[PDB]
């Protein structure tokens, strides 16, 4: 993929599965997950009372899929 | 071991160690302050930090880290060293063992626990079943 | 295009309708 | 003891670590991210399953998990 | 502690100090001296107190004092309202929210601001709230009607 | 009629035997 | 005259208990029109004003039309509602608009919600009515 | 370490108090415990079966033994409506003698306790008649528990130990289920009520002494080699006939009449036999279904994979994918438990429905308390198994349930739509529970107000036009079986109806309770149910469909049914597991139960007193169950033991105060949680260790507080136990003190 490609996360375990997001960056070094999107619908993470999550996660290419170009 | 260190300026409290740490195991915290101070106990009260080496036994390692965190830390203190004493005198030095904390990346340091996959590509339990093996083995 | 699930259904419904009719007093 | 497992999904962010009331856990070499590190339990005896670590994971879902398991004197916290 | 108080309170005025006074002075005491012999045992609080007492709030319906009937039974209702957020934690409210959101996500209307469950402390919080509002609101209208009707 | 002390006895003496087999039971579904 | 039921005029305990009105409003009336009002229906053994749903076009004014007012108005309500939450997710302001009200957009689609059924048979015919399963977030099994 | 719990190590290496609780509740998981092998598992199964079927008899050895020497059956035989039967003798040394006076009840000399599970009334219906009877059945029952107990033991023996093979075969186990159990033990049963119910209700004695050389029908054995059956149905017994003796005694066996026998106000001996011959007939027909080992039957596995209609595509029975659903239900005994268990509670549930309305005893329907008694107490076993029913399926969910042995069928989609699924019940729930609440408010408001008639009042006029349909003419349908001209009524090819004049008497004769006159307060009740079994219904769908993972937690299959939380962590995740959402259920099960019970107990005290305009007037508001039928009802309860005296209701008052303790202690486990106990209990060892004399004596494990499950576990135990105690004095009390 490619920065600012809205992209459909095929990941189970993500809260947002079969959402789309906007890739925010390909990490060019072979890691095992290089791509960052950051999405709008926040998390559940943090603690109990907590009025917030985070946006952005990490995923594979083959977890991965543009619609957008 | 033989640890040394002087005792902080404590009046004792009903939260310290118990018989847990004359026949199981007992923790101890060494440090050295700057400057005669003042720190909150993990068992609750207000303690004078001696100038030099201070030592101070508890009964848990996480009040030891406590200890560490939110008294030592932000008084600028980052050379204590916890340890594990045990009824026959013997003592395992614990929290900052290869000298470098823990939150720091260390060479030499090997992985111990670590899974090469997600949390999504663990097995199933009814695949997983009548064996040793567990959902979250490597 | 969905035929066998429309056929159990309006068959459900007629029997319904079969006791609606029973209880309006036209059977 | 309860038994920590890391999982490759790590970015090595220290959260964990940093939150580790027992000091369990430990930053330690790994080329799989841009961090360069990855977490570790090499102490999971004294692990009391406080899951503090998981609170400040911020990798969705979590690179560390916490599986409560058979208690002992260190993982039940009791000072006596 | 406040509730046995007050019932405490209510028993004894009723039964050994409340009443009415004869032209030749002798006090015919509301429930009749019973608090000597009936405060002794759980089963005489909750017969010559708690069932003997209520029968003017559940007798209350048409008449002055129907809405402390009402109150009597909404205050229940809020009570027993509480032991939901009292027993039950938030995974299963939040896990439940999901599909909610689900069905709103289907129809394209899930809202901007995401639906959550109560946090722990806000689920407590709402619980001893409603539990302390039907409760002390069961005492009042249960206190009210009674000792109007009867005082 | 009525129940006698002597059926009252048998049914003592009768119910002894389950409480063997209910005891060989619970040892061998220890093992 | 369903299911052994009469109407109120011919029932003993309904004219007995209007015989005793009490009166709900300020009217010095009140409980003589509300009682001729309920003679219309079926009371019973009670004389109580009992009510079928049943569709039963005679006695349809128990159930129906109220039916038919309640279903309206409420889906007036819900058609207003989702036009405003699709309405204020262009916007990238959308959650300061969901706890502060566009007040214009309110209105605008407050308004067109008298026509609330016809235009959901064309999203119902169109497929702007119902998201796809694929473009839903789901949850592990 | 310690030995106990030898079954897990990781208990048995516990140095807490924690050790043994968890033991005594994982002592009967057999498939988490150590050593635990399929071949183990299953004969464990096996074993543990044979125990509670001993266990079983013995108990009902017990009931048998004590009405037999302690109770006063013959009496009651003799007067069976205004003797009070005798479960057993009391013998508390702590009885003043105003309490042996208060319990020297029924014809007793000695304290005893008045008999109210119905037995006297079902062991006069089969036949016993003395209380040598009953000691027989008693011994008897005290030997199939020790064969019982010898099976158990000899099926864990080396050579006796039963194959995984015997285990896992469905066919041969359906047969002779279906055949053997339900076939054969029908067949016999109506042999029985044949050979000795209906003789003894015609006042012949049939025993065990002249049963070979007593025919049951005066020309009997030749007609049925002979096609000529109506011989064994020509003369029934006469509507003259008082049981137990052979004034006005007929002489059929297997009769049809329909109705209820107008003296013993049950459902006819004969009918009741020929009933039992028709179902032993249809139970060994389907049990001669699947092939087992002779070729010829069928084979559930060949059906579930069949994707052949006589050239047609379709995906599986009814076009619907059903491959390894077989393997799913046969491979996984929590699947299988959950599916028996949630049979056992339709079935259980529909055993309360048709006996207080279909009375099968003799003069059981005059026993009022009885009936209350068995109606509740089948009911509340009926949503403890409906909740276990769900409970084992989530169990299943999370332990056994293959999605590869599973991909492509019923559940896989069912597992596809679980949050459509859970969010309609959602929808339903809400519905529901808005609409009741609100009329019901409604009619309390105008009622409180001193208006009766703006009450919203909704005749149940679906269900009235049903009960028209059985034949009731109370409501003036005109329609099938309440019009003498329909079809139904008259069975126009054949002409065979014969049940349809003793049924008609039955439905439109009230003088029972055979499908009750309902009203509005039976419309806004049913819809109170309805809630119920619906929200119950979501708690335990929402656990089971979504125990496997969640959006919260996509990883809930590795942490067990069971387990506290996921921490406070991702925004809190109090009772998130599976095993949770059975423990919220429970509550609301419990509350479910409440409302059938205080709806059938209410309305039929309004009908044994005849005062049925109670109800009819009061159960429409929500102060009319308060007020008439809760504060009211208590009033001879409360005064079970008063300053004045002590009457024989002691027990059920003393019980009441008992279960409304027990139900607000849970309420402690259930509120307050851990961390609290845990420092409590820190400062207790503190105040142990350094108290002097004390510190001599130590803990053997270390004190703890209990677990979160734990205490969960322990708060719902004590809420359940106080609920159901409560509710059975109050039962007992409100309709013993009266009839
Ligand atoms: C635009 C608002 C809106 C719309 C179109 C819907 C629509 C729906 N809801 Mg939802 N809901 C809403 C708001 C809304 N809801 C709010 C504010 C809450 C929190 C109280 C919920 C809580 C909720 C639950 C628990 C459930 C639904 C369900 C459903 C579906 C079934 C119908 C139903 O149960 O009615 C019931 C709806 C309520 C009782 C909510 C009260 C109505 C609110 C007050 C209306 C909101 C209007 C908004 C405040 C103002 C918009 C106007 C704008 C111009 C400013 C349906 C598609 C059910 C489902 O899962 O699908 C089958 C279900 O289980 N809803
Ligand atoms: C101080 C209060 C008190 C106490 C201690 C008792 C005690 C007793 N009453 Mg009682 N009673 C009381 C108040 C009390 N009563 C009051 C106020 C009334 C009203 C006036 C009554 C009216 C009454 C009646 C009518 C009867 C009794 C009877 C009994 C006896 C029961 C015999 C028995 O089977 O034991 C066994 C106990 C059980 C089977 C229940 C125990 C279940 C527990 C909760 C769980 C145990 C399981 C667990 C795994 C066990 C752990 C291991 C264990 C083996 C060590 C018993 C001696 C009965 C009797 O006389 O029997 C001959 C009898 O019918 N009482
Ligand atoms: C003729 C052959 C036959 C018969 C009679 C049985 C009978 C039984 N088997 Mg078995 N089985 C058989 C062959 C047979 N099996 C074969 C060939 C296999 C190999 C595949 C198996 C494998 C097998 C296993 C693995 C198990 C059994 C079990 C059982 C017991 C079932 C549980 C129970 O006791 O409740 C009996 C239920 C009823 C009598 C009726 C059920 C409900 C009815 C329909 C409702 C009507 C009740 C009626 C109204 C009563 C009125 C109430 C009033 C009188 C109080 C039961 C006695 C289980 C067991 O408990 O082990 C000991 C179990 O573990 N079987
Ligand atoms: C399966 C249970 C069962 C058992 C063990 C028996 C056993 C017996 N029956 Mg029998 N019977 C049964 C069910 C049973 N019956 C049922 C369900 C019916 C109704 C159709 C009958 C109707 C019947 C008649 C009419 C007679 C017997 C008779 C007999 C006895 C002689 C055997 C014979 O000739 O035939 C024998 C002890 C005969 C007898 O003389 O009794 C002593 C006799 O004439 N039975
Ligand atoms: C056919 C019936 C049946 C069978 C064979 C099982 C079998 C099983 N169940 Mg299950 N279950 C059932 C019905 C059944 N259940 C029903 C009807 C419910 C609804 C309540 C449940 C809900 C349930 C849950 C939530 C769980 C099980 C679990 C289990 C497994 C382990 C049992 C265990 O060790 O815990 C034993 C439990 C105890 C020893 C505690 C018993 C509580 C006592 C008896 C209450 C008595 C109160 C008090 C003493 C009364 C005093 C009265 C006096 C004061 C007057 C096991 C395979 C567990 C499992 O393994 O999950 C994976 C699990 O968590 N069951
Ligand atoms: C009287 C006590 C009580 C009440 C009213 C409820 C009510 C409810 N429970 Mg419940 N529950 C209770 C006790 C109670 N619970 C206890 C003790 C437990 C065990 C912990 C449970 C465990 C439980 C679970 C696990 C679940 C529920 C669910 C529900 C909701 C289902 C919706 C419904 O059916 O009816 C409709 C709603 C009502 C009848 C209440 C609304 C009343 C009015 C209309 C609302 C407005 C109030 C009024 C205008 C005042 C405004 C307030 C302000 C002005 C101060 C509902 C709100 C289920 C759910 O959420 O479904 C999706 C769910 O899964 N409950
Ligand atoms: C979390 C719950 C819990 C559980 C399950 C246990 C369980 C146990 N404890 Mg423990 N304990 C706890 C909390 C708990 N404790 C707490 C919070 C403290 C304070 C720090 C202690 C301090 C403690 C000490 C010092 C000891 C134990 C011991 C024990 C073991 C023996 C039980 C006993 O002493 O009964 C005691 C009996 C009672 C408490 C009942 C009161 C008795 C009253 C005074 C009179 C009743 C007698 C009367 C005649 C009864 C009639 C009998 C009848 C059948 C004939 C047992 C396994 C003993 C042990 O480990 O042995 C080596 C022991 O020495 N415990
Ligand atoms: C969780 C889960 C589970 C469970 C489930 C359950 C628990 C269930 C159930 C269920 C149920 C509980 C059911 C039911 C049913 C019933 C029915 C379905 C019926 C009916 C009916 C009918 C059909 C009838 C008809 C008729 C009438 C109307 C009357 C007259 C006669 C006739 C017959 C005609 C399992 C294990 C699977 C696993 C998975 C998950
Ligand atoms: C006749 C009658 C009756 C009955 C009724 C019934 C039985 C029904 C039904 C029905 C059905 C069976 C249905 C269904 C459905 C399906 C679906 C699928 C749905 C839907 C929905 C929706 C889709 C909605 C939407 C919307 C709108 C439109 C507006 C607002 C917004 C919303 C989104 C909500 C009664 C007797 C009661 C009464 C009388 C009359
Ligand atoms: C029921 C329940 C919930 C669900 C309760 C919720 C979600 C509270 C919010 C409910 C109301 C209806 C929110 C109102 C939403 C809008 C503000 C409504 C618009 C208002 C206009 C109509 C005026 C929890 O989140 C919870 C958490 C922890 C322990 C126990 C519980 C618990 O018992
Ligand atoms: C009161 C309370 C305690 C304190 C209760 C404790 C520590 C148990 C102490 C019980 C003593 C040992 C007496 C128990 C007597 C029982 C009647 C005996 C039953 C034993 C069976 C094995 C037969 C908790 O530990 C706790 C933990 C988590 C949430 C809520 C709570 C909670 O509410
Ligand atoms: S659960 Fe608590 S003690 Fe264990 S590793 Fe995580 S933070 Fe450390
Ligand atoms: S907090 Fe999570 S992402 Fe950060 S180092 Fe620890 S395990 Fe890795």
Known sequence: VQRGSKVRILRPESYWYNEIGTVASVDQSGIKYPVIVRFDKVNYTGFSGSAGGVNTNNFALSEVEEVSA | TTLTGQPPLYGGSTGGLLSKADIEEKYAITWTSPKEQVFEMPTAGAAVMREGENLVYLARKEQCLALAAQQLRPRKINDYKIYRIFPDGETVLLHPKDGVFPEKVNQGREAVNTVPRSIGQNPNPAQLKFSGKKPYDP | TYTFRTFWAVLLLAINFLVAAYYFGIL | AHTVKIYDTCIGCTQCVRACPTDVLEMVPWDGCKAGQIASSPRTEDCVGCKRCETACPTDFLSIRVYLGAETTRSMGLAY | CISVVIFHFSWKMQSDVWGTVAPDGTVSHITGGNFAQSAITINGWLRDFLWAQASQVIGSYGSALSAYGLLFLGAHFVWAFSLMFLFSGRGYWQELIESIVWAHNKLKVAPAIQPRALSIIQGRAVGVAHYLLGGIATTWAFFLARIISVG | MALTDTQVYIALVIALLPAVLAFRLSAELYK | ?141 | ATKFPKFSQDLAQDPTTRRIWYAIATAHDFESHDGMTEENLYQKIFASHFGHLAIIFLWVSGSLFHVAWQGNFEQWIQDPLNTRPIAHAIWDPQFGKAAVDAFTQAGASSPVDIAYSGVYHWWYTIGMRTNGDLYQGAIFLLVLASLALFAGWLHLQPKFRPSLSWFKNAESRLNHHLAGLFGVSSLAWAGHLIHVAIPESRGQHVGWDNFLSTMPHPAGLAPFFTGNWGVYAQNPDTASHVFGTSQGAGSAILTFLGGFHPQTESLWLTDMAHHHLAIAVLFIVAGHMYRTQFGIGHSIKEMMDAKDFFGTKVEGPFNMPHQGIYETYNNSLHFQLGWHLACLGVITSLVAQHMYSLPPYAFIAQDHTTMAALYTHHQYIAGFLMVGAFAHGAIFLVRDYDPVQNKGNVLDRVLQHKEAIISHLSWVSLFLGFHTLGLYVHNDVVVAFGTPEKQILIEPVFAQFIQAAHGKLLYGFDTLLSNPDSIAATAWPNYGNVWLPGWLDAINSGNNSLFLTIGPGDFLVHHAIALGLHTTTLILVKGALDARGSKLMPDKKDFGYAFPCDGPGRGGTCDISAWDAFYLAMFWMLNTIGWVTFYWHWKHLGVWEGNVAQFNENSTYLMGWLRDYLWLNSSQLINGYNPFGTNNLSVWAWMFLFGHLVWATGFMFLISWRGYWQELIETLVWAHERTPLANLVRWKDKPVALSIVQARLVGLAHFSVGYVLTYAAFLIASTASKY
């Open chain 7, 1 to 141: 005259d369903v299911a052994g039921l009469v109407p109120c005029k011919d029932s003993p305990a309904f004219q007995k208990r209007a015989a005793a009105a009490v009166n709900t409003t300020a009217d010095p009336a009140s409980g003589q029109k509300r009682f001729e009002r309920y003679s219309q229906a079926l009371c019973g053994e009670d004389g109580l004003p009992h009510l079928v749903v049943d569709g039963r076009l005679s006695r349809a004014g128990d159930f129906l039309i109220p039916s038919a007012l309640f279903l309206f108005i409420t889906g007036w309500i819900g058609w207003v509602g989702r036009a405003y939450l699709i309405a204020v997710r262009n916007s990238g302001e959308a959650n300061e608009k969901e706890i502060i009200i566009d007040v214009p957009l309110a209105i605008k689609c407050m308004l067109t919600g008298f026509a609330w059924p016809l235009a959901a048979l064309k999203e119902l015919a169109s497929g702007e009515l119902t998201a796809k399963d694929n473009e839903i977030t789901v949850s592990p099994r």
